[PDB]
PDB file of C-alpha atoms (C1' of nucleotides) in Angstrom:
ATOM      1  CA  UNK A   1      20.433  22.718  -8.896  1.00 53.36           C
ATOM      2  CA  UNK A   2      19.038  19.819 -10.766  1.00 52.10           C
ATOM      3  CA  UNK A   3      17.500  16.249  -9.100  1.00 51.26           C
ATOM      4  CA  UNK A   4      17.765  13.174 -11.423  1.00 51.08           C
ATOM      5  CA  UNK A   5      14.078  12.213  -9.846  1.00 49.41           C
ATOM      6  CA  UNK A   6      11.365  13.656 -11.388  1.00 45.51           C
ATOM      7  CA  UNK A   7       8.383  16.171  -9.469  1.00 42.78           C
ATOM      8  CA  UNK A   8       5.473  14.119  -9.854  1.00 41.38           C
ATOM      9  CA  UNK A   9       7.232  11.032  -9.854  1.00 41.25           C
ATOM     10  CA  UNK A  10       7.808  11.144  -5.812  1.00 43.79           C
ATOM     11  CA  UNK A  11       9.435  13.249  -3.065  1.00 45.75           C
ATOM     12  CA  UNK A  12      12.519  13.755  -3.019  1.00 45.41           C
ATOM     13  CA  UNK A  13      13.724  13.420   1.051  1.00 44.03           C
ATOM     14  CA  UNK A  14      16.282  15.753   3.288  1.00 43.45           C
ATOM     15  CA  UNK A  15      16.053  16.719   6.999  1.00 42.73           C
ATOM     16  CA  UNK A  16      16.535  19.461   9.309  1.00 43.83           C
ATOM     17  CA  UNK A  17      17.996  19.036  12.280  1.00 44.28           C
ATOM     18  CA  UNK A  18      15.465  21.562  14.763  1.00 46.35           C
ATOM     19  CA  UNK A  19      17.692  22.588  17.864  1.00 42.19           C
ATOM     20  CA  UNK A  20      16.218  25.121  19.696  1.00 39.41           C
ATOM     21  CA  UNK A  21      17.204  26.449  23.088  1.00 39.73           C
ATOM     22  CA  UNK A  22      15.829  28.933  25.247  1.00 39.35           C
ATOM     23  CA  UNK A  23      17.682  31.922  23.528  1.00 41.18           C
ATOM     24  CA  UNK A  24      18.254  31.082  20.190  1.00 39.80           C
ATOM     25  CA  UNK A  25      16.651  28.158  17.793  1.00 42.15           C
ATOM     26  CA  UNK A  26      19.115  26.448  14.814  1.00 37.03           C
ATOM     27  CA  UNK A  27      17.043  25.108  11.569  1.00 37.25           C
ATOM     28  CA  UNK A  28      19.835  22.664   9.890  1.00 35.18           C
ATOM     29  CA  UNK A  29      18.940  21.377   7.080  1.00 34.28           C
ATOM     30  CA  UNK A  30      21.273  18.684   6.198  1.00 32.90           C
ATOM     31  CA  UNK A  31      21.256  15.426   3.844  1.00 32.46           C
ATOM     32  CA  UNK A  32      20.314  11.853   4.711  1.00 30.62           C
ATOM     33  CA  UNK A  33      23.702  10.775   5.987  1.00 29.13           C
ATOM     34  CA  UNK A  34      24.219  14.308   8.050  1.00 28.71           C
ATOM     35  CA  UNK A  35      27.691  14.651   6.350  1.00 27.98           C
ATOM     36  CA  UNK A  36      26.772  17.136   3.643  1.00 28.08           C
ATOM     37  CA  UNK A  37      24.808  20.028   5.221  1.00 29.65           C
ATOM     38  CA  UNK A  38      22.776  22.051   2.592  1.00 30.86           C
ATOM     39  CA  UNK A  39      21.821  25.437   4.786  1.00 28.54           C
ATOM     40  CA  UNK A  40      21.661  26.289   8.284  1.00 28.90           C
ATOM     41  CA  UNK A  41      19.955  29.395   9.549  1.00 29.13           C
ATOM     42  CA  UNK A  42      19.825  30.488  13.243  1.00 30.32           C
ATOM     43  CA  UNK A  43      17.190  32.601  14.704  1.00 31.59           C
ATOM     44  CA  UNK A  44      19.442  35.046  16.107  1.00 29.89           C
ATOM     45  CA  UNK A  45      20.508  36.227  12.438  1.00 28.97           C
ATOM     46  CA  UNK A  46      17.334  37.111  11.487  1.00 28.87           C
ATOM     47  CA  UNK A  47      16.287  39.521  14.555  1.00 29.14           C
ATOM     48  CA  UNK A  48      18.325  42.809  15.330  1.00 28.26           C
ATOM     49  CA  UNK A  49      18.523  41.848  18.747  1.00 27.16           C
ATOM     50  CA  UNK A  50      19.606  39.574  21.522  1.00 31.43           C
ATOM     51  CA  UNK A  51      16.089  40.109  22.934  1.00 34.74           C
ATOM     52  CA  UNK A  52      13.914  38.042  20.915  1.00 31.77           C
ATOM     53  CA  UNK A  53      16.518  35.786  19.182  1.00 28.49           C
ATOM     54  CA  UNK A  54      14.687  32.301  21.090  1.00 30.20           C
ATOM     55  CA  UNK A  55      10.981  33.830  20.166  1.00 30.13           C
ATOM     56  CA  UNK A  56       8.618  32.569  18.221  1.00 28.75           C
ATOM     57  CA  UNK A  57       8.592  34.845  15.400  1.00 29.04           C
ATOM     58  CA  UNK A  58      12.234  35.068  14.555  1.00 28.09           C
ATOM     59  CA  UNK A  59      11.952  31.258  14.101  1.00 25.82           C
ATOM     60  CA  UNK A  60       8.616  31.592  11.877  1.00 26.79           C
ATOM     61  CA  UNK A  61      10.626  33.255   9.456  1.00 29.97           C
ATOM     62  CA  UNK A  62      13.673  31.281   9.457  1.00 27.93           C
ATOM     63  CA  UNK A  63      11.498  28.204   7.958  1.00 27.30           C
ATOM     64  CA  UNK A  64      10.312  30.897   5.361  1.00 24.65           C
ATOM     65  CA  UNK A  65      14.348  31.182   4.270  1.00 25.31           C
ATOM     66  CA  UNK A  66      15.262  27.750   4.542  1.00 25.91           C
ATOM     67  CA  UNK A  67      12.456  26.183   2.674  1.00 26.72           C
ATOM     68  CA  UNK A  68      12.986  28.755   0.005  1.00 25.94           C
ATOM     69  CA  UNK A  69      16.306  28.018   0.284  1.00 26.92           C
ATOM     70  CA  UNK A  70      15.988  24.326  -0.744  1.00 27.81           C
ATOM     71  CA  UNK A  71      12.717  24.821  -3.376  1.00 25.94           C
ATOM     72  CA  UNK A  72      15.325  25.148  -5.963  1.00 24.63           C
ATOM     73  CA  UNK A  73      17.360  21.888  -5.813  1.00 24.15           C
ATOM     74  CA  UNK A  74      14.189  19.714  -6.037  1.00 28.16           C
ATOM     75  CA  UNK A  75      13.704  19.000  -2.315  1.00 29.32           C
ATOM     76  CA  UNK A  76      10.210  19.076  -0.941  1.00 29.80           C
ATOM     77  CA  UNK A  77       9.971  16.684   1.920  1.00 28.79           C
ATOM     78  CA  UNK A  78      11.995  16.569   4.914  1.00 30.23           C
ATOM     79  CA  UNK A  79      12.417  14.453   8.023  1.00 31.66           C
ATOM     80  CA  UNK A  80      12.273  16.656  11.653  1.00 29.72           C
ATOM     81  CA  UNK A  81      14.686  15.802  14.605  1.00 28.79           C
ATOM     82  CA  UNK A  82      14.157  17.522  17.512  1.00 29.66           C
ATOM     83  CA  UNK A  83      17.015  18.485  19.811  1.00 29.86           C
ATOM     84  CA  UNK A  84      16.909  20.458  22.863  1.00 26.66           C
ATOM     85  CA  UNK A  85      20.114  21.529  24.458  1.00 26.99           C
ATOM     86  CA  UNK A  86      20.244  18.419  27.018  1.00 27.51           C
ATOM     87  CA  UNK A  87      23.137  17.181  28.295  1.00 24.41           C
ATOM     88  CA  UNK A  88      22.869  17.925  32.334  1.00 26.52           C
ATOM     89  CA  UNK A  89      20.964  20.777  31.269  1.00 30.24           C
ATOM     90  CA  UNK A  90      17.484  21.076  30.218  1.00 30.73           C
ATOM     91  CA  UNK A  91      15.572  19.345  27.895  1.00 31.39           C
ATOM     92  CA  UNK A  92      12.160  20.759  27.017  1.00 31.68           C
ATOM     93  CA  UNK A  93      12.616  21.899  23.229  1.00 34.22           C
ATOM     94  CA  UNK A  94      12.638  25.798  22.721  1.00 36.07           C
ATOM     95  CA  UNK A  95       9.506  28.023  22.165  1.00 36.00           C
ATOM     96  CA  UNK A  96      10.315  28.725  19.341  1.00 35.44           C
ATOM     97  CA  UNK A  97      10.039  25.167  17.733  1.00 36.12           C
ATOM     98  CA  UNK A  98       6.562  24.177  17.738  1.00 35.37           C
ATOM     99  CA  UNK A  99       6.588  27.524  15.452  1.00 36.72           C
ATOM    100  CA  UNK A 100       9.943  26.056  13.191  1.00 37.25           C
ATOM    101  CA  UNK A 101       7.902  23.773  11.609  1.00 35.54           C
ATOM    102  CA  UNK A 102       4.531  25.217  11.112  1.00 32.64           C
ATOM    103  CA  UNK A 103       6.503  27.964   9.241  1.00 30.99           C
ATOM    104  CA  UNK A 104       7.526  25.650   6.673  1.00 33.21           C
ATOM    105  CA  UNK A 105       4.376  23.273   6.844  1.00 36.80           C
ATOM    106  CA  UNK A 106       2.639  26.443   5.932  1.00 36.29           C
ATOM    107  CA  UNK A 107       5.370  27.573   3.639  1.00 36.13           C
ATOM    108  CA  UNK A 108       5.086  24.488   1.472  1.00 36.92           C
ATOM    109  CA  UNK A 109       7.517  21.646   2.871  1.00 38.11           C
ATOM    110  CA  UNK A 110       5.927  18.425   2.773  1.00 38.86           C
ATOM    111  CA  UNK A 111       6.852  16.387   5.828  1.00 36.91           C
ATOM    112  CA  UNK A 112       8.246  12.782   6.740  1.00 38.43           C
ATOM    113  CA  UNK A 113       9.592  11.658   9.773  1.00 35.02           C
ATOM    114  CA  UNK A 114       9.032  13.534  13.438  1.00 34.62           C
ATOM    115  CA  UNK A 115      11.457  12.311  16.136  1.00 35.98           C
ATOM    116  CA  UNK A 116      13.591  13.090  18.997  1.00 33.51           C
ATOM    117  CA  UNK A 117      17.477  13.259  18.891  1.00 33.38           C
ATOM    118  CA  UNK A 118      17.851  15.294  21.847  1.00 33.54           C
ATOM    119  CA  UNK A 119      21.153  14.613  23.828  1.00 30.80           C
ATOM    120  CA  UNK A 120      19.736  12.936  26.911  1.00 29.66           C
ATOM    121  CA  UNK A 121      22.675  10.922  28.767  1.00 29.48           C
ATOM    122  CA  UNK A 122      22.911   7.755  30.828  1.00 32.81           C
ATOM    123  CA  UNK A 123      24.548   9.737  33.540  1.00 32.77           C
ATOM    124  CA  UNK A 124      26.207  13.639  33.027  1.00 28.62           C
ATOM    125  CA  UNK A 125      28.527  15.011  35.460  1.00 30.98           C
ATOM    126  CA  UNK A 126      28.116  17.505  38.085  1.00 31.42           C
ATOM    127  CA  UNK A 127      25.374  20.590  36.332  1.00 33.10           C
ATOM    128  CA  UNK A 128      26.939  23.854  36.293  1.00 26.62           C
ATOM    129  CA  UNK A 129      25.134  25.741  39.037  1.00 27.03           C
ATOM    130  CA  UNK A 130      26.126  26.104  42.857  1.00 26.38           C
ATOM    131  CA  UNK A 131      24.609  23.486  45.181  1.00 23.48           C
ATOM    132  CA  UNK A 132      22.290  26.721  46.286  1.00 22.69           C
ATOM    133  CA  UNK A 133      21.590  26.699  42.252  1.00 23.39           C
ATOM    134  CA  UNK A 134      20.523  29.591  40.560  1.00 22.57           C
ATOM    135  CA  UNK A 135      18.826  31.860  43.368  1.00 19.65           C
TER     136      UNK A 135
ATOM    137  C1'   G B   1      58.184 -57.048 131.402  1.00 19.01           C
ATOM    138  C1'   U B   2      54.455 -58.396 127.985  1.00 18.42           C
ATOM    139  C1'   U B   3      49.768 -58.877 124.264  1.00 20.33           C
ATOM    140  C1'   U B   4      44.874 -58.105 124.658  1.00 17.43           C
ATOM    141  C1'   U B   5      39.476 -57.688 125.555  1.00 17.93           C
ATOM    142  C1'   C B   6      38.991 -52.533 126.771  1.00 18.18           C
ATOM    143  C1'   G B   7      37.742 -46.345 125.159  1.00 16.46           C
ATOM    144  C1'   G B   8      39.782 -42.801 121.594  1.00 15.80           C
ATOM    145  C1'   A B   9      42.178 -41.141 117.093  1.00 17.80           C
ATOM    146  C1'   A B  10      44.219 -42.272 112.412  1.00 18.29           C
ATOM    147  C1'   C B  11      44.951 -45.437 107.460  1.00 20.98           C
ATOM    148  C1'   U B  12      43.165 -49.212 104.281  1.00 19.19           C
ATOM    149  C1'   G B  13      40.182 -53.843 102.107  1.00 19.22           C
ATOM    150  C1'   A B  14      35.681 -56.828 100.953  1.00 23.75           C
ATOM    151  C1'   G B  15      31.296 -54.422 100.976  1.00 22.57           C
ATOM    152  C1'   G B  16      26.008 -54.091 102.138  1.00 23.86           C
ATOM    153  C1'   C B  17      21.851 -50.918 101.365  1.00 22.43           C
ATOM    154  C1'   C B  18      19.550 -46.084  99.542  1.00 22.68           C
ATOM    155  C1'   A B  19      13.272 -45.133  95.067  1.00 23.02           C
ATOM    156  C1'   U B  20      21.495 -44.857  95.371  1.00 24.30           C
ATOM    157  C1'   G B  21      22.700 -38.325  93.492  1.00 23.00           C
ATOM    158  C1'   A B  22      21.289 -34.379  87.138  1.00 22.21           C
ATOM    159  C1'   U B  23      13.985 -29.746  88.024  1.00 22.03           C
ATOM    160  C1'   U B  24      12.397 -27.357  83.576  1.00 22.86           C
ATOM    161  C1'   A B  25      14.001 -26.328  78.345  1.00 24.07           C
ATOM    162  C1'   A B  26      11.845 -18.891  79.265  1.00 21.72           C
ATOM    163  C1'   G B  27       6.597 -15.921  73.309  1.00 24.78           C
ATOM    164  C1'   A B  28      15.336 -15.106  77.650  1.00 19.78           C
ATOM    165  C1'   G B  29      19.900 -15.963  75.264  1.00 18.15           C
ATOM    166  C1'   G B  30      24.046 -18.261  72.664  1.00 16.51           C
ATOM    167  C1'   G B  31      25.586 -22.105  68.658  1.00 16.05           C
ATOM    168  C1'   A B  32      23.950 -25.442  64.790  1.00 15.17           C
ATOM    169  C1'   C B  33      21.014 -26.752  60.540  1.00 12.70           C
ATOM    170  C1'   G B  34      17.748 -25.564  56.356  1.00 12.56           C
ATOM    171  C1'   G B  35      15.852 -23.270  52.114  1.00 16.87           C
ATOM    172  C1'   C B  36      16.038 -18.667  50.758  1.00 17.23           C
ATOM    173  C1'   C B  37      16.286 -12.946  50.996  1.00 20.81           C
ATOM    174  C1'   G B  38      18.428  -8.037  50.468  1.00 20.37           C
ATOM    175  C1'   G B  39      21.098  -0.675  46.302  1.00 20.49           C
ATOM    176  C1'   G B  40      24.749  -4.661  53.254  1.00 21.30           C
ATOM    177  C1'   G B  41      30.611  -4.846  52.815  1.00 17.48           C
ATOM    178  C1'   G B  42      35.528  -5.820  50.215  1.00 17.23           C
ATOM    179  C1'   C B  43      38.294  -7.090  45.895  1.00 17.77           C
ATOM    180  C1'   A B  44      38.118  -7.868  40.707  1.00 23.34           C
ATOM    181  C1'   U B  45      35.427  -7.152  36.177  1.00 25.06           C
ATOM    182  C1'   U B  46      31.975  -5.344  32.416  1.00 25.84           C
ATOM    183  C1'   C B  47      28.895  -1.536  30.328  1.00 24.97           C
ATOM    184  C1'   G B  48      26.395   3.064  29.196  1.00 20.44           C
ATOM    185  C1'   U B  49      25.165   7.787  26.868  1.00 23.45           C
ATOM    186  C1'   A B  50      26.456  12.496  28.052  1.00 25.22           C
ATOM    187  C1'   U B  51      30.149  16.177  28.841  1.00 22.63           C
ATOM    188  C1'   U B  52      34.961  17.916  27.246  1.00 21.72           C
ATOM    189  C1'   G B  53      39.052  17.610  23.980  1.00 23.08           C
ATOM    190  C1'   C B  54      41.540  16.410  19.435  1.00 20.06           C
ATOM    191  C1'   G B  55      41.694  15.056  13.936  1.00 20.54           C
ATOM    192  C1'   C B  56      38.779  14.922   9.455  1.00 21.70           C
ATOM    193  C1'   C B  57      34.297  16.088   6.685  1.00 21.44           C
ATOM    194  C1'   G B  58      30.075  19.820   5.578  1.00 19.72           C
ATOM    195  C1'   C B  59      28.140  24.679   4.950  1.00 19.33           C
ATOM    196  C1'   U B  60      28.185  29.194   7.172  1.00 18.69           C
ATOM    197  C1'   A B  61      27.538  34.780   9.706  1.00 17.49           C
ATOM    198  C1'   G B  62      27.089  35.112  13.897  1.00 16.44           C
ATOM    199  C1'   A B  63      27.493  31.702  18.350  1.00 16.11           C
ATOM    200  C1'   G B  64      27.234  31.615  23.736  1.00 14.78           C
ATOM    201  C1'   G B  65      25.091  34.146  27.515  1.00 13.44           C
ATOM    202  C1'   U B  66      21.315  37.221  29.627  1.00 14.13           C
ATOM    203  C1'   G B  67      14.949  40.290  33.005  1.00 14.12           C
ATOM    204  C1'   A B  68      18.071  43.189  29.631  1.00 13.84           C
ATOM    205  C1'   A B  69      23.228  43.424  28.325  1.00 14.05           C
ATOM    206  C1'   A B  70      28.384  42.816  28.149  1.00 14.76           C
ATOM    207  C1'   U B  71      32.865  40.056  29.369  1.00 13.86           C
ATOM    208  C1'   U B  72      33.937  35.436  25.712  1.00 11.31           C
ATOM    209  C1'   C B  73      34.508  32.461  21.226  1.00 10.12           C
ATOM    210  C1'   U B  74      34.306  33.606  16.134  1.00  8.18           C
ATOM    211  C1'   U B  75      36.544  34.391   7.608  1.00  5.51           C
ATOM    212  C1'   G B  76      43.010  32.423  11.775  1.00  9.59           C
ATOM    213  C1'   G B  77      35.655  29.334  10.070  1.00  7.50           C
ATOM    214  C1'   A B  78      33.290  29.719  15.530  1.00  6.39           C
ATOM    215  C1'   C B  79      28.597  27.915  16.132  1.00  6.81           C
ATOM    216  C1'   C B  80      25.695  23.605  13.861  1.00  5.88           C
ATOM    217  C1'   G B  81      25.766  18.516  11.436  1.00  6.55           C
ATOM    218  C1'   G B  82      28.708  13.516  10.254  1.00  6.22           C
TER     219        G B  82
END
RNA sequence: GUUUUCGGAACUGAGGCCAUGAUUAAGAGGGACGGCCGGGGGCAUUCGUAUUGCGCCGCUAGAGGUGAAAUUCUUGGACCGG
């Protein structure tokens, strides 16, 4: 659990990949090049319940685990990539997101990089849902 | 008997003369011609993420889904990332 790089030196970079959906939210916090994944916590492992697994507070404490998670190997400032669930379907980023990263903000993880990586498409195929939709 | 001037019909030649014979170009149409215009058509071609699937790589206990749940997938490594 030891960087090369020292503290007061600079900041040493990751990023978490912020997916949230509207019933559970996925904190991913990955390396650089995405290939070597660190930790990823959900939001539905952290509530006893399929109720509130997309809220706002299960996901205010899964930046309080993840950060703590990554104190230790020297990491301190991340990049953010948002990610809703897209595709045909929606893209508005979970609720529970805007709370993701004030968690950690307020946790202690410096921050880098905002941006979107949500899976918008040129052109999906036919959305699930009858022609009626969802009534 | 006959041919005629004589009256009719019929054919043809040289003609003469006519004020010698054709309204207009539809704020109707057709066709041309011109520069263009357009998600008109047909054939061919080229692209785009997404979805899904498969292989590898990562690290993992849940993931999906729901007003709420469960059916379902999941240490046989799903989900999530490359």
């Amino acid at each position: 659990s030891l960087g090369p790089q020292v503290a007061e030196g600079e900041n040493v970079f990751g990023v978490c990949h912020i997916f949230a959906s509207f019933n559970d939210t996925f904190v991913h916090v990955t390396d650089l090049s995405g290939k070597e994944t660190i930790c990823r916590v959900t939001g539905g492992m952290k509530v006893k319940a399929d109720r509130d697994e997309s809220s706002p507070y299960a996901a205010m404490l899964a930046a309080q685990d993840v950060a703590q998670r990554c104190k230790e190997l020297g990491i301190t400032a991340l990049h953010i990539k948002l990610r809703a669930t897209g595709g045909n379907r929606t893209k508005t980023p979970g609720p529970g997101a805007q709370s993701a990263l004030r968690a950690l903000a307020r946790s202690g993880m410096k921050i880098g990089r905002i941006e979107d990586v949500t899976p918008i498409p040129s052109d999906s195929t036919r959305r699930k849902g009858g022609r009626r939709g969802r009534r």
